[PDB]
């Protein structure tokens, strides 16, 4: 199999509109926001404008192929793939995707998509000009799927983000935490999952 | 409650809007 | 039936341009605005910029499937479904949809769509810096259908949705049906009036 | 005939690239602006930003159906229909359509499309802060068709628009006039039409 | 009246525009 | 032939992605900017925001039809036609097309497209508030084609067009076609430079 | 073969979603930014807004045709072609493409695409009002492909861009340098490439 | 005259641009 | 390292995330 | 020169970039 064959096979099997659950197990989606920049901050309106890489991975076993004597990965446009319907519940702008909309698909059926996204959030911005800094909280989850269809699994739960964040921003990152939260309501048997991202940052001295 | 979680809301017509 | 079958079926069967009335009864649409934020307010121009979830539900019985040995719900892109042509009559900007455009379809044919929307409105902003606050009215209805084709109902009267970080606080949200009959015309015209009573925080 | 049939037939018969002239008579188009709001006005730059419903009606007899045992009207997406190529000659922004893009089609073949539109115009803004007010003229016509292909007619010549205009605008409407102009040029045998909408308005005191 | 409700308007050609 | 027939034939015949050269002669394109308004001017950043009708004409002989006992013109959406890849080399924004995207096609195959366009340019804006005024130059040409594939020419011919309500007035418009042949390269490279001399009104 | 034939053959052969590697050699891509303008600069936020031509070239041998008695080049819409997934890693806005999206394809299968792009970057803006000027670094590479699938190379390397840059900008270009970086990480056998564009510029006196 | 009306313009190649 | 180069990241699941 | 005209540029790979 060459790359053309693999891509042909993926186009034949992949259903962009069909969540790839296997036997009613949830699709485990791993998600980690890597902050690149904080562009604009307003302490009066409590709004922040940020750029981050949204590292997202999951598995679609139907995409798998035998990779002895074949490439073990290819780049595939996301319009040919199912992607999780993730959204930030406190976003006040559409996510602007800055980058080419290509995922990486591994021969075992793993999908890796890491778009660079610019987006505005309504956030606690107080203390941004102090030493402790501001702590801006972003809640991310599936817009339509509960925990028996999609699980959201934060990776890199604690980091200073030093490897990603622009040295040229007027802000510096003190700490980023990404934590899983699941609620069960008395009305309804299933659980609801999200990642709470806490971005603790301040204006540079 | 359910209705203020977007997924719970649309999953539960009898409970929510 | 697996999810793929159901979704395939729905895409083949659903007619996005065809109102799914059953035996000339209206499609009963429920609509309820959940306010998430008030971003900008202008007391001089009487304009507000708001973010809200528009919880909308209705039935398309043609989408139904037998769910005994199958999933009883799926997520479906709205471009594959008929959606009610609801609009806010006093909107002064296009609704900017912030979220993935997927509805939830239940096996009995119920459809639930709850987009997060950012939109600007012309409305009464006077008193926004007082204790009683401003009361901004938003009227939502079908752009082209009367009440024998689409009926619209609320779901009547904050804290569980609204950002604690907004400059504003919500005092009260009221959502009421209006049905008007004009002398000219036998059928009724409905809308849902949302009254958003809010003020600048101290 | 059920609604699905009618909609199918309309989508198949209406051709967005084909003006529905019958026996080489013009398509008679009515246009009538109902003003909803005046959002911004600049007396220095002579610009206004307005919201209006653009009631547009015309007939395509080939869309007609027998309505005895069928709905007498249906709502149809305008992307399935020919629509007249009307433009405002003194617009300085794209018309931003705020509403669902559905027309109403009656069983005799009449089509009614009334989008809510936000748009900016270059026009006479002088006197806006006086009692007589400013009079802003907006000229609307076919971008490519002469009067033997499309005729454009105003509907009502005179209105205060009290029933449409927002009580919350900073401005009030004194008068709206909508008049047909027809010009024949020496060079060219056919006539050129437009509707001149004169919006007489002032800042509330 | 009818004509200032968008749906009533387009549903009633004989009444509105 | 009725209009439907002509449009059907055009849709069958037209190749929107293929330059309609006849016998390896260039497609002769005429272009003429008719200035309607100057909306914003910045003398510090040397940027202007202008609205103009871009009168563009050329021939696609494959579109021709016999027009005895038929209409001799029709209006055609430009998405069904080849259009020249013209660009303004000193534009700093996308051309915002304000009007319906329909061209006029004549039975001999002539195509006439005149969109109203709003666009920003990097321009000499100095002197805009003086009597001599500023002179802003806009250079238009084919983005990818040389002169043996597309020739671009002005139009054998201000203020029958320009808004009387603009805060600016047009003093003068000059049009200069340039064709250059370099020793390196066999073909010639063309553009039309439109010089718009304008000032703030008293 | 006329241009219609060539375009038909390209549409038959080209797979826009399949990287045209030949025998598992990388696709060699050349990229060179030609600066046309610097529109806005902020020394406080370290942001610049720039317009540049992104000259990009590569080869897809499957597109080749015999060009005796045929055209030896054609202009082709990029939607019919594979294009490299290049991105600027420190971009803070989507690339706004200002020009017609046509590439030039030569009969030997070379593809040349040079869009005019407006885009904002986070970069070192300090010294912009001094004689030495600011030096703003833009890193460009493939979003998903390593160096055995796509290699990215500069062309010129050193230029004042005098042939391209608007004389009407508030800024002047002192120097533009374009250099390749290749990194190999301990974890991973393949190399990761980018082109670093260093734009040395200052406010005119 | 003709040429400053957009429709008249494109309808009359021999007269206008 | 690898994970802060976008291509290296998605090419190396076992290393990144 | 050739390279500062966009069409001449992409028409002449051996001359330009």
Author numbering:
A (entry chain C), D (entry chain E), G (entry chain B): 1 to 205
B (entry chain H), E (entry chain I), H (entry chain J), I (entry chain G), J (entry chain F): 1 to 17
C (entry chain D): 1 to 155, 157 to 158, 161 to 205
F (entry chain A): 1 to 157, 161 to 205
Paper text:
OmIA, α-conotoxin purified from Conus omaria, is an α4/7-conotoxins that competitively antagonises α7 nAChRs. nAChRs are prototypical ligand-gated ion channels found in the central and peripheral nervous system, and recently in other biological systems such as in immune system, muscles, skin and lung. Among different nAChRs subtypes, the homopentameric α7 nAChR is one of the most abundant nAChRs in the nervous system and also in many non-neuronal cells. We determined the co-crystal structure of OmIA with Lymnae stagnalis acetylcholine binding protein (Ls-AChBP) that identified His5, Val10 and Asn11 as key determinants for the high potency of OmIA at α7 nAChRs.
The structure of OmIA and Ls-AChBP was solved at 2.47 Å resolution. A tight homopentameric ring assembly of subunits was observed for the OmIA/Ls-AChBP complex, where OmIA occupied all five binding pockets located between two adjacent protomers. The N and C termini of bound OmIA orientated towards the top and bottom of the LBP, respectively, with the central helix abutting into the binding pocket. Structural superimposition with the HEPES/Ls-AChBP structure revealed that the C-loop of Ls-AChBP moved out a comparable distance (9.3 ± 0.4 Å from the Cys187 Cα atom) and had a similar backbone orientation to previously characterised co-crystal structures. Each of the five bound OmIA molecules interacted in a similar orientation (RMSD = 0.090 ± 0.005 Å) at the interface between two adjacent Ls-AChBP protomers that formed the principal and complementary binding sides. Most interactions on the principal side were between His5 and Ala7 of OmIA and C-loop residues Tyr185–Tyr192, as well as interactions between the disulfide bridge of OmIA and the vicinal disulfide Cys188-Cys189 of Ls-AChBP. His5 resided in a pocket formed by aromatic side-chain residues, specifically Tyr89, Tyr192 and Tyr185, and formed hydrogen bond with Tyr89 and the backbone oxygen of Glu193. On the complementary side, OmIA_Asn9 interacted with a surface comprising charged residue Lys34, polar residues Ser32, Gln55, Tyr164, and hydrophobic residue Met114, in which hydrogen bonds were seen between Asn9/Gln55 and Asn9/Tyr164. OmIA_Val10 interacted in a pocket formed by Thr144 on the principal side and Arg104, Leu112 and Met114 on the complementary side of Ls-AChBP. The surface interacting with OmIA_Asn11 in the co-crystal structure comprised mostly polar and charged residues from both the principal (Thr144, Glu149 and Tyr192) and complementary faces of each subunit interface (Gln73 and Arg104), where hydrogen backbone were seen between Asn11/Thr144 and Asn11/Gln73.
